[PDB]
Amino acid sequence: MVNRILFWTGFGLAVRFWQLGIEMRPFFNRKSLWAYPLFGGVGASFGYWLQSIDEKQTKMLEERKQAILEKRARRAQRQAE
Amino acid sequence: NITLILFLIGILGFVLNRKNIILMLISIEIMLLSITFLILLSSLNMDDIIGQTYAIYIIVVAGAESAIGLGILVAFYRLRGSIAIEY
Amino acid sequence: FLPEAMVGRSKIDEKYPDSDYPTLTDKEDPDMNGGYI
Amino acid sequence: MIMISILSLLLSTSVTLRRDMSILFNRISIIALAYCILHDTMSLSFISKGIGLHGGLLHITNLTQIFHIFIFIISILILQLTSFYPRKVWIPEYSSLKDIFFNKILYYRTKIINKMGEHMKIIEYPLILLFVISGAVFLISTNDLVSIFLSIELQSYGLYLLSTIYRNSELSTTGGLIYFLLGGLSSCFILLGTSLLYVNSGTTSLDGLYILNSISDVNSWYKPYYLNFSLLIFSIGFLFKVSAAPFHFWSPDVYDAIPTIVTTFVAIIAKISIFIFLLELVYYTNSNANSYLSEFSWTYALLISSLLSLIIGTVVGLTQFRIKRLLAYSTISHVGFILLALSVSSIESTQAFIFYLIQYSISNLNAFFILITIGFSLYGYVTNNKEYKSLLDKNNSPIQLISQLKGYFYINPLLSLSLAITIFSFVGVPPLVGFFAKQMVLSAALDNGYIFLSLIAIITSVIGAVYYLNVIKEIFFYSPEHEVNPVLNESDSNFSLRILNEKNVLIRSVLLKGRNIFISSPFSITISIITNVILLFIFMNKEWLSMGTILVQILFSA
Amino acid sequence: PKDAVHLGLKGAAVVGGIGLLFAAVRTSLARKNVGPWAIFTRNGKLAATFAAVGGAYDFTRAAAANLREKEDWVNNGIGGLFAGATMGLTTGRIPRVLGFAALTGVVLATAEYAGSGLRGVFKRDVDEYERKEFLRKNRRRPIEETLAEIGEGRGIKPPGYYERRAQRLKEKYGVDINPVCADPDQ
Amino acid sequence: MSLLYVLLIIPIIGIFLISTIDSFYFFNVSYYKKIALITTILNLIVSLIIYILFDFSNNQFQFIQENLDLSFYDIYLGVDGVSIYFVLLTTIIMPIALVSNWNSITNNIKSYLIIMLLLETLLLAVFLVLDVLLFYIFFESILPPLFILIGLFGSSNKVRASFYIFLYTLLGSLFLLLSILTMSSIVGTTYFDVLLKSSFEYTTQLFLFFGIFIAFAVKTPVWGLNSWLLRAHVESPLGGSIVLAAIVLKLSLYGVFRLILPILPQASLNLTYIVYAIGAITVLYASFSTLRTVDVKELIAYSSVAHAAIYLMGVFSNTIQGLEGAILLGLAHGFVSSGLFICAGGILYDRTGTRLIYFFRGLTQIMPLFSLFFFILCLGNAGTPLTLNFVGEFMSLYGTLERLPIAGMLASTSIIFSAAYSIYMYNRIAFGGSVSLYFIDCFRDLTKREFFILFTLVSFTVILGIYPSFVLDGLHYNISSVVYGIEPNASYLT
Ligand SMILES: CCCCCCCCCCCCCCCCCC(=O)OC[C@H](COP(=O)(O)OCCN)OC(=O)CCCCCCCCCCCCCCCCC
Secondary structure, eight states: OHHHHHHHHHHHHHHHHHHHHHTOOOOOOOOTTTTHHHHHHHHHHHHHHHHHHHHHHHHHHHHHHHHHHHHHHHHHHTTTT | HHHHHHHHHHHHHHHOOOSSHHHHHHHHHHHHHHHHHHHHHHHHHHHHHHHHHHHHHHHHHHHHHHHHHHHHHHHHHHHHHBBBOOO | OOHHHHHHHHHHHSSGGGGSOOOTTTTTTTSSSSOOO | HHHHHHHHHHHHTTOOOGGGGGGHHHHHHHHHHHHHHHHHHGGOOOOOSEEETTTTTTOOOOHHHHHHHHHHHHHHHHHHGGTTTTEEOGGGOOSSSSHHHHHHOOOOHHHHHHOOOGSOOOOTTHHHHHHHHHHHHHHHHHOHHHHHHHHHHHHHHHHHHHHHSSOOOOHHHHHHHHHHHHHHHHHHHHHHHHHHHHHHSSOBBHHHHHHHHHHHHHOOOOHHHHHHHHHHHHHHHHHHHHTTSSSOOHHHHHHHSHHHHHHHTTTTTHHHHHHHHHHHHHHTTTOOOOOOOHHHOOTTHHHHHHHHHHHHHHHHHTTBBBHHHHHHHHHHHHHHHHHHHHOOOSSSHHHHHHHHHHHHHHHHHHHHHHHHHHHGGGEEEOOHHHHHHTTTTTTTTTTBGGGGGEEEEEEOOHHHHHHHHHHHHHHTEEEEEHHHHHHHHHHHHHHTOOOOHHHHHHHHHHHHHHHHHHHHHHHHHOOOOOOEEEGSSSSSSEEEEEEEOOOOOOEEEEEEEEGGGOOOOOHHHHHHHHHHHHHHHGSSHHHHHHHHHHHHHTTTTT | OOHHHHHHHHHHHHHHHHHHHHHHHHOOOOOSOOOTTTHTSSSSSHHHHHHHHHHHHHHHHHHHHHHHHHTTTTTHHHHHHHHHHHHHHTTOOOOHHHHHHHHHHHHHHHHHHTTTEEETOOOOOOOHHHHHHHHHHHOOOOOHHHHHOOOSSSOOTTTTHHHHHHHHHHHHOOOOOOOSOOOOOO | OHHHHHHHHHHHHHHHHHTTTGOOOOHHHHHHHHHHHHHHHHHHHHHHHHHHOOOOOSSSSSSSOOOOOSSSSSBBBOOOHHHHHHHHHHHHHHHHHTTTTTTTSSSHHHHHHHHHHHHHHHHHHHBBBBBBHHHHHHHHHHHHHHHHHHHHHOOTHHHHHHHHHHHHHHHHHHHOOOOOHHHHHHHHHBBBHHHHHHHOOHHHHHHHHHHHHHHHHTTTTOOSSSSHHHHHHHSSSSHHHIIIIIIHHHHHHHHHHTTTTTHHHHHHHHHHHHHHHHHHHHHHHHHHHHOOOOOOOHHHHHHHHHHHHHHHHTTTTSSHHHHHHHHHHHHHHHHHHHHHIIIIIIIIHHHSOOBBBGGOOOTTTTTTHHOOOOOOOOHHHOOOSSSSHHHHHHHHHHHHHHHHHHHHHHHHHHHHHHHHHHHHHHHHHHHSSOOTOOOOOOOOOOOOHHHHHHHHHHHHHHHHHOHHHHHTTTTHHHHHHOOBBOTTSSSOOO
């Protein structure tokens, strides 16, 4: 249950909730209600960005593992002599 | 060898001094001169102008930090009226 | 160069008295029950 | 970009004497650092152990650039303290987007928002702030012995200036004197260590020193004892600047004496730059073959200091009653963990080192942010406690004693829980980010045979938890000594606020009270994001931990 | 073997020299004018105590090594036992004698068993990938290796338990094993 | 959304509604208590649905949800027989804990309910996680809510109590963490399905055993490491005490099944004579000590120590009977100790304001419903038959005797002293003269609330005492997987 957008949409929603509680300001006054879509919208944007970062990190880590078996192979093959 | 003895004199300034904070500022000046003198003599032995350049930037920086330290002392003394540690 | 109320062991002694931990003797507290007669 | 901003800010600052410009200059410094993040985000599209720059005097790595950005982000967050007034007036009739973006509100703000507070009248404060940043990022990117010395003085001299910039506080000038005097002694040991390297090796280049170290690590006439001994003297000066034991006495005094907002920057930024700099120097000087070199390795000074910091940080914090001295000792114990991870030079420990440094910087930032916010919140409260009245520099350090936090859970329960989460993250309670940081360091130390240090790390952690619990007990177990201000809510003490449109025409007129005076949004939001990162780390750990994994693989890439 | 007295003197000197260092700092940090000869007058006890603990510690471990004819972690803990005991003797409190002996002997023993990296951990100098893989997949082992560590019985009854069980009982009790048939027809 | 994840989500929704309902309605405190109670009821309803679907003879973890989005620290949930009944005990107990404090909090009610609801999610997570690090993360996550519960709602000495339970647990858990990290380093993973498949070397198993056992001994607790229980379980609020005794004591017991029996069987076999010496000592020293305890809740708290020693001896017996008896005794002690704390901390302490046994006498004369349930709970604490306490004690003690007879006999002696301290307390409170002359006001008998949180607890122990098969049927195949040994002619079929 680790969805980047759902989690980070909720994270932004939780940031607004905790913020209003810290200020001891009411959690839901109707004129301020635009903020939860805003906080959750910015939260969703951060997590679409984390999506692309995770994709590039996975590719780079996958590339590193190949280089590591590659290094072990040519060292082991050199020891065959 | 002289440079080493000078570093001890700057070191010994902190050992012998319980109450003179001005001597603490002076002992740093002695240490920094001792280290710069060592670099200068070594630069002469190794025919290296970079040693002289390094020493020039130490003189610049140690002169810059002396001014900051005196300014900090002046802001301190403006409120206290003494540079003496009660001990 | 700093005041006593900020660095002095004296304020620590007030905040943590040695008296807060009762030490006694078999003379006044033989039964180790705090002097309970 | 940091250098253009410093020069440009100075020119604009040079021709003004208006202290009402201070808040604006702080905001421009935030904007300037945002461009610095942009230019360094642009620079990460390459994989290399290092590219020497500018005649070989500087260098760039993926690690260097990541921690430039981190230093910039921490500095933007800290700069908020001097860029926004601590308190605001909020009402439901001025909460819509059409309101904030098309209408204006009017009231006598000066006393309410503390428009003329000392921390809002120092023109040059953001400028000295950027000078320290320049020293920190130059130290990260330093490739030469002379560059090392110049960058460390640049960062150090700025920190002395910041400790004294509140020139009318007797405490601040006293703290500035102490940091400069003991800091100047520390800089001699760095210059002495750098000089001893040059006089023996004949080079100021770190590249050349690593080559000399590498060939000499074989398994006669010029045996290279100088390298470990010089770096030992060189390292001692850097241990002072991170306040590592036994070189830590200055920081509980300096951190308590200087104002809290200044303490926030001074106690955070300097450790990041020195530790990152030390990390590379530990890697390239780490001998492989068990020869006579490894037995005199300078890195034992790091392992001894980690041991001594674990004990001093936790034991001495037990009796602290002033909140800022406790944080200073809490920091010393945490650099004990950081130094253990730096000393074990493993892939695992370097990942642990990288993660621990970032999460502790974020967490320590939260504690200072929460402490400043609690100070700004007590404006509408009064107390008759005789101890609080006898405090010095109450305006610079509103919260000075742990007893001042007594019953803060009844004054602001959710802000008190954010403090408790942060402090529980310091102890290492799962599933908080602080636990996962300590867990990685212990697993890496255990996997490298550091059993004895791992056992002392766990034992000192229980001792350290006692004074952490002691802060929490004051906030939650007792009723508060602070009462709400009667004259702020007395059924007739109401101040006026006007709501006006784009054409400065009246729309409404509302009468307001002290209960309409709230914490400013920048501080509540920053506390709220960081608190939730600490609490919810277990759901968000993949990218953050993968970054360090990749960084260490590049550093270790055979 | 080793010279117990000679090693103790080196032990007494090395950690007594640091006590002499700490004694000079007390004299230097002394407030009233006590002169330079208060190094051994007012703080000579401090330096003397250090020279005693370091002497007691290095004597006994060397002595424990001679008595046991072995070199292992046991000797440092034993060395730390008297080292800890010596410090307690200065306070003149028996619980201080035992407790500081216990503290020192335990830390100094786990330091040698674990081998704290304060001077550097031992480098394996082998393919460290391979050791982990062997430890990772050694999922089935010969039964003999387990039988050496855990033994026979206590619910561990490998095939052939009953035959050797009779032989063991005959050797110890001299009684033949022969359970009686439970069927009258047999 | 797996049923197991539903279990952890419901109490978090209740927290959300509790802390937001004021923005939709000054809201009455009764509302908060009703939201919290219904929240725990629906959590119980879900755990009952799971149990109907649960299969008694499967070696696969059941009701697991595929993640496949692997991260560094992922939460996998799954349930088998050894974990199914601990999950049920947590879901049954917590509603009773909520009702047991309905009237006795009266301040910071929102904080009490949020802490109580959070504790449910964490404790359930402990029994459901399929990873050894995941186990540790939840075993320790409960300390800060526990620390703040005692300090906010505890009795006069709640500061010393909250520190003791926090620091004891952390210090022991830090030694368990060291052992857990060594395991993950060697194996590369702490997931149950692949860590149990591995085989540790004997001396590794030996040092892994000490680290884990030091934590499980602080949490049992064993005698001499039990100061925290004496303080915390007495100074805690009644709901806290019920959760602390009936659920939190069980984590170390359930942890022996997942952390030492499968991976450290050689160490466990070779060190049983040390576990049994500590287990035997705890049975005697605790039993003698609670005979002289004058605080009624501390007497009842001290009984938990003696019984926890008996099922601690059972789990190390390597026998089918001991292991089943250990879970059944840990379950039985959950109901009975919960009732005895309601009797002491809830019924007596609300009427008198004191817990000293010196002030109570002849309560049967004015309170015959309290005495009727108190006696049945004093019988169950004494291991009387037709209570689930006897079936667990007899099976746990049989395994202890068979594995090592000298410890079995000594642990058997608890049949005398449990009876001794349980009946002696019962007489000094319910019998033993006429109503105590210290009471100025007369006392009322059980309220409907007190009657029905006791009738419920005495029903569970009695029905399970007559038909323990309800629980044993779902333990036979899974308990079998943790046994270590082989028979001469059944091993190695061909
Ligand atoms: C499955 C993984 C889950 C991971 C964690 C996910 C989140 C779990 C919960 C973390 C904290 C959530 C807090 C929820 C309550 C927030 C809402 C709130 O404001 O409650 C306010 C409440 C009462 O205060 P109030 O009503 O405003 O004042 C009235 C005075 N007459 O005041 C309170 O309720 C405060 C209650 C006491 C503090 C909570 C208990 C101790 C928590 C220690 C925090 C550090 C450890 C965090 C552990 C998280 C779970 C492991």
